RNA sequence: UAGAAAGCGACGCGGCUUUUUGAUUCUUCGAUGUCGGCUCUUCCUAGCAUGGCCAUGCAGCCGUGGCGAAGUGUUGGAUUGUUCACCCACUAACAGGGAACGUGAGCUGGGUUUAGACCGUCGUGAGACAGGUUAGUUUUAUCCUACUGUCCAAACAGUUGAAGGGAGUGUGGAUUAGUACGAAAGGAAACCCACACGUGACCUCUGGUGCAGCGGGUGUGCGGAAGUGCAACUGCCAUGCUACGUCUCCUCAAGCAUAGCUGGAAGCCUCUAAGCUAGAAAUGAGUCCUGACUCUGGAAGACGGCCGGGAAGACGACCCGUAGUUAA
RNA sequence: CCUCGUCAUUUAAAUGGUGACGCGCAUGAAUGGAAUGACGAGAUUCCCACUGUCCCUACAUGUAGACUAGCGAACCCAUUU
RNA sequence: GAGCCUCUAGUGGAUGUUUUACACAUGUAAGGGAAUUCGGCAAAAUGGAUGCGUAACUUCGGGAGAAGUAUUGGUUCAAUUG
RNA sequence: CCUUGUUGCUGUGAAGGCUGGCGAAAGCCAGCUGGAGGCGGCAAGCCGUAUUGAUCUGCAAAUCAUUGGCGUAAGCAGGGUA
């Protein structure tokens, strides 16, 4: 539900994959918007329990701050979608996948993309729930 | 039913075993096990690993294309 | 003072005290409600745990409200357990009467001829016996005592159950010469019908196909694996303490307040873990078959038995009839289990769907198994 | 916006609580270890979320005031020794408290409060300062009782069920539907599917581990090679164990608040004075775990040790075998 | 003292650090005042590398410990718990 | 005359059992990388020799091994210390 | 205070000296030789920072492990004397 600053209006179904990315993780930005590295500060949809750090998998929306990028863009808070992950995932058909490096892509409150082109490969399941990503990805797996 | 053929070893992979590794070059590749994935990372040439189907074909111990 | 932050309890109090089970063989203690509107039928059976494998099935399950036009079909990979079920033999019956103190047994009646395997349960040490066990009982057939006995059972009873034993000599890997004995309830019809149905079948063999069929939901009762004496970190799941502490980190730090001046039964302590009775409800039968008849799917046109290359690790090859069920089951290989018809029917959509298999894995369970049959291994290697 | 009372409620008046700080000195000075955090359990209600309802200045959406209810929840961080405070991020929501200001023979030792030393202010001085600063030893259960499991009281085979325990909770998407309702702007209401946290099990797959097994090299020993010690390094990996893996979790009955039916008192009226109907995440049962006293059966021998194993194990105990698909 | 002083910089967020300012409860000149180099098991803040400190724990080794032969104490004690 | 391995010369006992939990000395770990805590306490990482290349400030002596980077085994040869 | 014992391996490279170049002079720049210092890294030793580790009915009325500080010198030590 939409509360606080930077609310999200476009909620989607989670997949139950392993959660490789958590608060504290620094990861690359894959789009052409001008950010380069993002530092993870929160995850949408997490209600929390004692002593556990919030974590995310592919398809989930993270809150992050821009730690490398153009001057206009640094030290600001932003929303992004996780498109690939280095931790292993299992499909319901039993196939297992693993990428070389993790990455995310920046979005608006309405779920629209910030940039126009995405570097490198993207996970098939993400393109099923975020249809706009299908248009501008490098390859689908 | 098979999952495919392992990239490094040449071995056919049974359904429901092994893993795909996807590089930033955009290629997807299938490995039989962690053993042979690690040998790729460490740049061991497959033709020198004498139990592999690749090595046996190269030596002419096994008839191939 | 109140504690600083909220958190849930560690472990469930539904299973405390967690003591060790008394013997390894379970009785079915509860049976589904009788209904006089149906034919006479049995309600349970005994089985032995063989091992696990995996299968691929086709599916088409989706939300009824999903707007997608196409009849999408999808492969799913699932893990399964195999149980061996040789035919049981009927050897007697018991009648019970209802009282203000529950059900009480009136009399028990046995068959004229009994097997060496069942008489062996009655003695303690197998190899030291005079074998004068049931030798005088057959006279009761001549005397008409049997005919007086049936009259009393038929006259004054509310519930009727048969006695059945299992043919252990068919499963050599058990190293066992004494049969297991179970008391099984009959539902349907009237007391008279139940008694006549039983009388017709003393000394005979009932196959598992009498009791269960494919796609049915069943309850499985068994005793879990044993793990010895264990600490609180494993027995109840409590967190490990700070790294620089003296006198040990793997413990509950505080076991009570000053008042009351005693330890409460709700606090975690070290002790026995594992070897307890547990019942798993609503497991579904994927397949039923026989250990030495080959089978095929619509898609896998190979013809093979259920047995993997080299057999199951400490068991060997299945020979009798078998059941295959979804998911994992209590206890290690070789333990006895009790099977029961489901106590009540399920409303969940995941339970009530059809099952269509396309592949079953038959590769070796020792090491990395990479062939499905000896023919493939002989073709991969030379000659 | 009319109007005491939807919501408020001046000036005055009566109570309850012990969670704040005072007031007093009854108990302990041949000693009851003193602040905060960590860990873990239970209780209270003055109800923050989640369920059922009543009023409204209740069109709808969002709210506000009240009633029965304590089953399940109430988080991750930055500065600070802090309880407290104040900000950032998430959330259905981030309510408030008690148990010797719960908890040091459970830990920790940052603060305070022995002996060293610096600064400011006071003192002729030795020295002072709920002013600031830095360094400063955390002992012992083998007794009794509680608590957790284990054996005996209880021959062997099959059972019974007194009594005790108890468990599932919540979020989202789709559809109803851009519908009702509204001038417009906006904008609701089952069934089905995905997930998180909690609970109980399991190794087919995938990670992890390397005791058994196979290989490799460095320094130095056994005249060389082969087989190898010691110092230790290193690649792979059976069985097993494990989670970062896989499977798992609803149905009756009596009825709260309320809203109703029939109906007198009191020819009318009226949910109540008798009687009846619908009714909550609450209560009591069943399915789930433990198993008191019992009940039914076989036979002149039965049972224990000793010997050998494990699917079981601290020791007992449990599951099994002994002239055989027995062992080597 | 008031006090977690005000303004700037460092963080997503600063009872912290550094830079400025000054009617300074109660700074200050051999009761020695001020600005640096080289050297401290001295006190304090930040960045890179690195990691079982942590999320969240799992498996394995040696030595004790349990059971057994030989040997064999003490603290403490109104005691009926 | 470091640590590690050998020659001369010298050396040893509370018994059996594969042995749970909790300890005390140690190893290894997916993805993340100080989120832990008063505080990076403990651990990990770096490490010898040869070459290239080295800042502010300074009492001109130093800073300085600054930082940052590359090379290294066996064999068979040339050339004579490179 | 008197008489004695106890310095092994390595790095850096002051004063003084010899060649070659530049300069009208004064004196500047290279390469080599030389080996100073309460100067650096270590050994034998002397000490006592951390783990607030082990032990606390101890091996011990102050010990043990790993980790640390100095080690060509206002350093350490035996006997005689005050």
Tab-separated table of N, CA and C (backbone and C1' of nucleotides) in Angstrom, chain G residues 2-53:
chain	number	residue	atom	x	y	z
G	2	C	P	85.129	2.445	41.036
G	2	C	O5'	85.711	1.092	41.674
G	2	C	C5'	86.890	1.114	42.540
G	2	C	C4'	87.178	-0.300	42.995
G	2	C	C3'	87.410	-1.343	41.885
G	2	C	O3'	88.737	-1.341	41.340
G	2	C	C1'	85.915	-2.215	43.495
G	3	U	P	88.988	-1.894	39.850
G	3	U	O5'	88.622	-3.450	39.970
G	3	U	C5'	89.661	-4.440	40.294
G	3	U	C4'	89.051	-5.823	40.273
G	3	U	C3'	88.733	-6.357	38.878
G	3	U	O3'	89.918	-6.854	38.282
G	3	U	C1'	86.899	-6.795	40.354
G	4	U	P	89.920	-6.932	36.682
G	4	U	O5'	89.029	-8.241	36.387
G	4	U	C5'	87.959	-8.243	35.382
G	4	U	C4'	87.014	-9.419	35.577
G	4	U	C3'	86.148	-9.778	34.358
G	4	U	O3'	86.821	-10.642	33.440
G	4	U	C1'	84.743	-9.615	36.242
G	5	G	P	86.556	-10.369	31.875
G	5	G	O5'	85.193	-11.158	31.558
G	5	G	C5'	85.114	-12.596	31.797
G	5	G	C4'	83.660	-13.017	31.798
G	5	G	C3'	82.886	-12.808	30.488
G	5	G	O3'	83.118	-13.799	29.482
G	5	G	C1'	81.579	-12.054	32.319
G	6	U	P	83.177	-13.241	27.975
G	6	U	O5'	81.664	-12.870	27.615
G	6	U	C5'	80.673	-13.924	27.499
G	6	U	C4'	79.332	-13.273	27.240
G	6	U	C3'	79.268	-12.397	25.989
G	6	U	O3'	79.074	-13.250	24.870
G	6	U	C1'	78.192	-11.303	27.814
G	7	U	P	79.868	-12.924	23.510
G	7	U	O5'	78.730	-12.214	22.626
G	7	U	C5'	78.965	-10.843	22.283
G	7	U	C4'	78.125	-10.413	21.114
G	7	U	C3'	78.962	-10.088	19.875
G	7	U	O3'	78.902	-11.191	18.961
G	7	U	C1'	77.464	-8.269	20.432
G	8	G	P	80.195	-11.615	18.089
G	8	G	O5'	79.582	-12.671	17.047
G	8	G	C5'	79.020	-12.188	15.813
G	8	G	C4'	77.982	-13.170	15.339
G	8	G	C3'	77.233	-12.759	14.071
G	8	G	O3'	77.912	-13.167	12.877
G	8	G	C1'	75.674	-13.396	15.736
G	9	C	P	78.070	-12.059	11.716
G	9	C	O5'	76.716	-12.162	10.867
G	9	C	C5'	76.245	-13.455	10.433
G	9	C	C4'	74.869	-13.264	9.844
G	9	C	C3'	74.703	-12.025	8.963
G	9	C	O3'	75.368	-12.238	7.718
G	9	C	C1'	72.829	-12.264	10.397
G	10	U	P	75.539	-11.001	6.701
G	10	U	O5'	74.055	-10.882	6.102
G	10	U	C5'	73.717	-9.668	5.410
G	10	U	C4'	72.317	-9.222	5.748
G	10	U	C3'	72.094	-7.742	5.456
G	10	U	O3'	71.971	-7.553	4.055
G	10	U	C1'	71.154	-8.246	7.539
G	11	G	P	72.773	-6.282	3.487
G	11	G	O5'	71.734	-5.095	3.807
G	11	G	C5'	70.501	-5.029	3.039
G	11	G	C4'	69.592	-3.952	3.582
G	11	G	C3'	70.003	-2.498	3.341
G	11	G	O3'	69.625	-2.113	2.016
G	11	G	C1'	69.279	-2.781	5.593
G	12	U	P	70.479	-0.995	1.225
G	12	U	O5'	70.354	0.304	2.158
G	12	U	C5'	69.260	1.242	1.985
G	12	U	C4'	69.306	2.294	3.074
G	12	U	C3'	70.405	3.358	2.943
G	12	U	O3'	69.877	4.466	2.221
G	12	U	C1'	70.344	2.511	5.176
G	13	G	P	70.850	5.193	1.172
G	13	G	O5'	72.159	5.504	2.038
G	13	G	C5'	72.219	6.723	2.810
G	13	G	C4'	73.502	6.693	3.602
G	13	G	C3'	74.783	7.044	2.818
G	13	G	O3'	75.831	7.770	3.516
G	13	G	C1'	75.023	4.968	3.869
G	14	A	P	76.403	9.213	3.055
G	14	A	O5'	75.739	10.132	4.201
G	14	A	C5'	76.041	11.552	4.331
G	14	A	C4'	76.312	11.938	5.773
G	14	A	C3'	77.736	12.460	5.977
G	14	A	O3'	77.833	13.836	5.582
G	14	A	C1'	77.256	10.819	7.624
G	15	A	P	78.956	14.248	4.509
G	15	A	O5'	80.312	14.260	5.362
G	15	A	C5'	80.415	15.138	6.521
G	15	A	C4'	81.634	14.796	7.347
G	15	A	C3'	82.984	14.779	6.625
G	15	A	O3'	83.576	16.069	6.432
G	15	A	C1'	82.797	12.893	8.036
G	16	G	P	84.224	16.445	5.000
G	16	G	O5'	85.472	15.448	4.810
G	16	G	C5'	86.645	15.580	5.672
G	16	G	C4'	87.494	14.325	5.613
G	16	G	C3'	88.130	13.993	4.258
G	16	G	O3'	89.259	14.801	3.904
G	16	G	C1'	87.179	12.019	5.178
G	17	G	P	89.377	15.262	2.360
G	17	G	O5'	89.680	13.898	1.550
G	17	G	C5'	91.034	13.333	1.495
G	17	G	C4'	91.037	12.004	0.753
G	17	G	C3'	90.989	12.051	-0.783
G	17	G	O3'	92.245	12.351	-1.445
G	17	G	C1'	89.537	10.307	0.059
G	18	C	P	92.286	13.263	-2.780
G	18	C	O5'	92.330	12.257	-4.031
G	18	C	C5'	92.995	10.979	-3.933
G	18	C	C4'	92.419	10.047	-4.982
G	18	C	C3'	92.099	10.660	-6.354
G	18	C	O3'	93.283	10.909	-7.140
G	18	C	C1'	90.296	9.263	-5.647
G	19	U	P	93.148	11.793	-8.479
G	19	U	O5'	92.576	10.676	-9.475
G	19	U	C5'	92.292	11.056	-10.830
G	19	U	C4'	91.167	10.231	-11.397
G	19	U	C3'	90.365	11.023	-12.420
G	19	U	O3'	91.041	10.961	-13.681
G	19	U	C1'	88.884	9.937	-10.920
G	20	G	P	91.304	12.376	-14.407
G	20	G	O5'	89.923	12.663	-15.184
G	20	G	C5'	89.322	11.623	-16.016
G	20	G	C4'	87.838	11.882	-16.201
G	20	G	C3'	87.400	13.300	-16.586
G	20	G	O3'	87.591	13.588	-17.975
G	20	G	C1'	85.939	12.435	-14.938
G	21	G	P	87.959	15.093	-18.426
G	21	G	O5'	86.574	15.895	-18.224
G	21	G	C5'	85.516	15.770	-19.222
G	21	G	C4'	84.200	16.240	-18.652
G	21	G	C3'	83.980	17.752	-18.625
G	21	G	O3'	83.658	18.246	-19.921
G	21	G	C1'	83.143	16.758	-16.637
G	22	C	P	84.277	19.691	-20.266
G	22	C	O5'	83.483	20.713	-19.308
G	22	C	C5'	82.076	21.013	-19.586
G	22	C	C4'	81.495	21.918	-18.524
G	22	C	C3'	82.191	23.267	-18.361
G	22	C	O3'	81.907	24.143	-19.457
G	22	C	C1'	81.623	22.354	-16.230
G	23	G	P	83.038	25.213	-19.883
G	23	G	O5'	83.277	26.149	-18.593
G	23	G	C5'	82.387	27.285	-18.341
G	23	G	C4'	82.632	27.870	-16.966
G	23	G	C3'	83.976	28.556	-16.713
G	23	G	O3'	84.073	29.843	-17.350
G	23	G	C1'	83.373	27.220	-14.835
G	24	A	P	85.203	30.163	-18.458
G	24	A	O5'	86.522	30.377	-17.560
G	24	A	C5'	87.669	31.106	-18.072
G	24	A	C4'	88.242	31.992	-16.991
G	24	A	C3'	88.177	31.481	-15.547
G	24	A	O3'	89.221	30.534	-15.282
G	24	A	C1'	87.425	33.726	-15.621
G	25	A	P	89.079	29.686	-13.920
G	25	A	O5'	89.562	30.758	-12.831
G	25	A	C5'	89.487	30.396	-11.447
G	25	A	C4'	89.036	31.581	-10.628
G	25	A	C3'	88.222	31.181	-9.395
G	25	A	O3'	89.071	31.077	-8.261
G	25	A	C1'	87.022	32.791	-10.636
G	26	A	P	89.211	29.597	-7.658
G	26	A	O5'	88.042	29.541	-6.550
G	26	A	C5'	88.076	30.397	-5.361
G	26	A	C4'	86.684	30.868	-4.992
G	26	A	C3'	85.693	29.783	-4.550
G	26	A	O3'	85.746	29.472	-3.146
G	26	A	C1'	84.654	31.173	-6.174
G	27	G	P	85.848	27.927	-2.684
G	27	G	O5'	84.600	27.171	-3.355
G	27	G	C5'	83.258	27.645	-3.086
G	27	G	C4'	82.354	27.228	-4.221
G	27	G	C3'	81.903	25.763	-4.114
G	27	G	O3'	80.513	25.422	-4.263
G	27	G	C1'	82.726	26.241	-6.274
G	28	C	P	80.030	23.958	-3.758
G	28	C	O5'	79.307	23.344	-5.057
G	28	C	C5'	77.986	23.813	-5.392
G	28	C	C4'	77.704	23.553	-6.848
G	28	C	C3'	77.446	22.094	-7.231
G	28	C	O3'	76.112	21.688	-6.907
G	28	C	C1'	78.864	23.112	-8.828
G	29	C	P	75.980	20.186	-6.340
G	29	C	O5'	76.096	19.281	-7.663
G	29	C	C5'	75.060	19.355	-8.676
G	29	C	C4'	75.488	18.595	-9.911
G	29	C	C3'	75.745	17.099	-9.730
G	29	C	O3'	74.515	16.380	-9.685
G	29	C	C1'	77.436	18.046	-11.087
G	30	A	P	74.538	14.987	-8.877
G	30	A	O5'	74.738	13.969	-10.108
G	30	A	C5'	75.439	12.735	-9.883
G	30	A	C4'	76.068	12.233	-11.161
G	30	A	C3'	76.850	10.930	-10.951
G	30	A	O3'	76.007	9.763	-11.038
G	30	A	C1'	78.295	12.534	-11.903
G	31	G	P	75.614	8.980	-9.675
G	31	G	O5'	76.652	7.746	-9.656
G	31	G	C5'	76.870	6.974	-10.878
G	31	G	C4'	78.322	6.571	-10.981
G	31	G	C3'	78.919	5.867	-9.758
G	31	G	O3'	78.410	4.527	-9.613
G	31	G	C1'	80.469	7.421	-10.679
G	32	C	P	78.256	3.922	-8.125
G	32	C	O5'	79.773	3.809	-7.602
G	32	C	C5'	80.578	2.669	-7.987
G	32	C	C4'	82.025	2.947	-7.675
G	32	C	C3'	82.452	2.789	-6.214
G	32	C	O3'	82.670	1.411	-5.843
G	32	C	C1'	83.403	4.776	-7.155
G	33	U	P	82.502	0.940	-4.308
G	33	U	O5'	83.723	1.628	-3.536
G	33	U	C5'	85.072	1.137	-3.668
G	33	U	C4'	85.972	2.011	-2.827
G	33	U	C3'	85.729	1.971	-1.310
G	33	U	O3'	86.461	0.936	-0.663
G	33	U	C1'	85.947	4.220	-2.041
G	34	G	P	85.851	0.318	0.686
G	34	G	O5'	85.816	1.515	1.742
G	34	G	C5'	87.000	1.829	2.525
G	34	G	C4'	86.670	3.001	3.423
G	34	G	C3'	85.654	2.720	4.532
G	34	G	O3'	86.318	2.360	5.760
G	34	G	C1'	85.005	4.681	3.295
G	35	G	P	86.000	0.937	6.449
G	35	G	O5'	84.808	1.281	7.443
G	35	G	C5'	85.060	2.240	8.515
G	35	G	C4'	83.775	2.990	8.764
G	35	G	C3'	82.703	2.206	9.531
G	35	G	O3'	82.105	3.061	10.509
G	35	G	C1'	81.861	2.959	7.432
G	36	A	P	81.693	2.467	11.948
G	36	A	O5'	81.007	3.740	12.648
G	36	A	C5'	81.810	4.923	12.883
G	36	A	C4'	80.931	6.151	13.024
G	36	A	C3'	79.632	6.022	13.838
G	36	A	O3'	79.805	6.370	15.233
G	36	A	C1'	79.243	7.192	11.757
G	37	G	P	78.948	5.707	16.438
G	37	G	O5'	77.465	6.252	16.179
G	37	G	C5'	77.121	7.614	16.567
G	37	G	C4'	75.704	7.868	16.114
G	37	G	C3'	74.627	7.126	16.918
G	37	G	O3'	73.419	7.877	17.097
G	37	G	C1'	74.485	6.509	14.637
G	38	G	P	73.231	8.777	18.411
G	38	G	O5'	72.694	7.847	19.608
G	38	G	C5'	71.586	6.905	19.430
G	38	G	C4'	71.495	5.973	20.624
G	38	G	C3'	70.083	5.504	20.985
G	38	G	O3'	69.713	4.294	20.296
G	38	G	C1'	71.278	6.248	22.955
G	39	C	P	68.403	4.315	19.366
G	39	C	O5'	69.073	4.336	17.915
G	39	C	C5'	69.041	5.574	17.157
G	39	C	C4'	68.616	5.362	15.711
G	39	C	C3'	68.051	4.004	15.282
G	39	C	O3'	66.728	3.834	15.817
G	39	C	C1'	69.429	4.918	13.551
G	40	G	P	66.129	2.354	16.018
G	40	G	O5'	65.788	1.865	14.508
G	40	G	C5'	64.411	1.995	13.944
G	40	G	C4'	64.268	1.345	12.578
G	40	G	C3'	64.016	-0.165	12.535
G	40	G	O3'	62.659	-0.534	12.824
G	40	G	C1'	65.643	0.403	10.902
G	41	G	P	62.390	-1.871	13.678
G	41	G	O5'	62.618	-3.062	12.648
G	41	G	C5'	61.709	-3.229	11.524
G	41	G	C4'	62.146	-4.451	10.738
G	41	G	C3'	62.178	-5.775	11.511
G	41	G	O3'	60.888	-6.366	11.705
G	41	G	C1'	64.167	-5.552	10.222
G	42	C	P	60.629	-7.178	13.073
G	42	C	O5'	61.468	-8.540	12.906
G	42	C	C5'	62.225	-9.114	14.027
G	42	C	C4'	63.236	-10.118	13.507
G	42	C	C3'	63.896	-11.055	14.533
G	42	C	O3'	63.114	-12.217	14.860
G	42	C	C1'	65.559	-10.130	13.049
G	43	A	P	63.248	-12.879	16.319
G	43	A	O5'	64.702	-13.541	16.354
G	43	A	C5'	64.982	-14.806	15.674
G	43	A	C4'	66.412	-15.225	15.949
G	43	A	C3'	66.758	-15.499	17.406
G	43	A	O3'	66.263	-16.788	17.770
G	43	A	C1'	68.494	-14.244	16.382
G	44	A	P	65.714	-17.023	19.264
G	44	A	O5'	67.010	-16.835	20.184
G	44	A	C5'	67.780	-17.993	20.569
G	44	A	C4'	68.935	-17.534	21.425
G	44	A	C3'	68.580	-17.012	22.819
G	44	A	O3'	68.372	-18.072	23.764
G	44	A	C1'	70.145	-15.533	21.769
G	45	G	P	67.301	-17.967	24.966
G	45	G	O5'	67.381	-16.465	25.526
G	45	G	C5'	68.080	-16.202	26.777
G	45	G	C4'	68.476	-14.745	26.853
G	45	G	C3'	67.555	-13.806	27.646
G	45	G	O3'	67.779	-13.858	29.070
G	45	G	C1'	68.130	-12.808	25.573
G	46	C	P	66.531	-13.989	30.089
G	46	C	O5'	66.092	-12.467	30.365
G	46	C	C5'	67.076	-11.483	30.813
G	46	C	C4'	66.604	-10.093	30.450
G	46	C	C3'	65.199	-9.715	30.933
G	46	C	O3'	65.138	-9.328	32.308
G	46	C	C1'	65.486	-9.040	28.671
G	47	C	P	63.769	-9.630	33.106
G	47	C	O5'	62.623	-8.953	32.197
G	47	C	C5'	62.011	-7.704	32.620
G	47	C	C4'	61.272	-7.036	31.481
G	47	C	C3'	59.741	-7.033	31.567
G	47	C	O3'	59.331	-5.935	32.407
G	47	C	C1'	60.504	-7.371	29.306
G	48	G	P	58.140	-6.032	33.491
G	48	G	O5'	56.826	-6.076	32.569
G	48	G	C5'	56.437	-4.908	31.780
G	48	G	C4'	55.390	-5.310	30.760
G	48	G	C3'	54.010	-5.724	31.302
G	48	G	O3'	52.920	-5.453	30.418
G	48	G	C1'	54.939	-7.496	30.036
G	49	U	P	51.980	-4.177	30.650
G	49	U	O5'	51.254	-4.166	29.219
G	49	U	C5'	50.815	-2.908	28.610
G	49	U	C4'	50.144	-3.129	27.263
G	49	U	C3'	48.927	-4.066	27.201
G	49	U	O3'	47.710	-3.439	27.636
G	49	U	C1'	50.372	-4.467	25.336
G	50	A	P	46.512	-4.340	28.222
G	50	A	O5'	46.000	-5.163	26.946
G	50	A	C5'	45.080	-4.580	25.977
G	50	A	C4'	44.849	-5.571	24.855
G	50	A	C3'	44.014	-6.794	25.230
G	50	A	O3'	42.633	-6.458	25.086
G	50	A	C1'	45.918	-7.476	23.990
G	51	U	P	41.602	-7.123	26.128
G	51	U	O5'	41.355	-8.583	25.516
G	51	U	C5'	40.809	-8.744	24.169
G	51	U	C4'	41.075	-10.166	23.722
G	51	U	C3'	40.455	-11.256	24.607
G	51	U	O3'	39.180	-11.613	24.088
G	51	U	C1'	42.712	-11.822	23.968
G	52	U	P	37.780	-11.119	24.699
G	52	U	O5'	38.075	-9.929	25.722
G	52	U	C5'	37.612	-10.066	27.069
G	52	U	C4'	38.778	-9.783	27.983
G	52	U	C3'	38.864	-10.667	29.225
G	52	U	O3'	39.478	-11.902	28.836
G	52	U	C1'	39.349	-8.370	29.739
G	53	G	P	38.745	-13.226	29.354
G	53	G	O5'	39.374	-14.349	28.417
G	53	G	C5'	38.705	-14.704	27.178
G	53	G	C4'	39.403	-15.865	26.500
G	53	G	C3'	39.759	-17.064	27.384
G	53	G	O3'	38.662	-17.955	27.522
G	53	G	C1'	41.668	-16.434	26.147
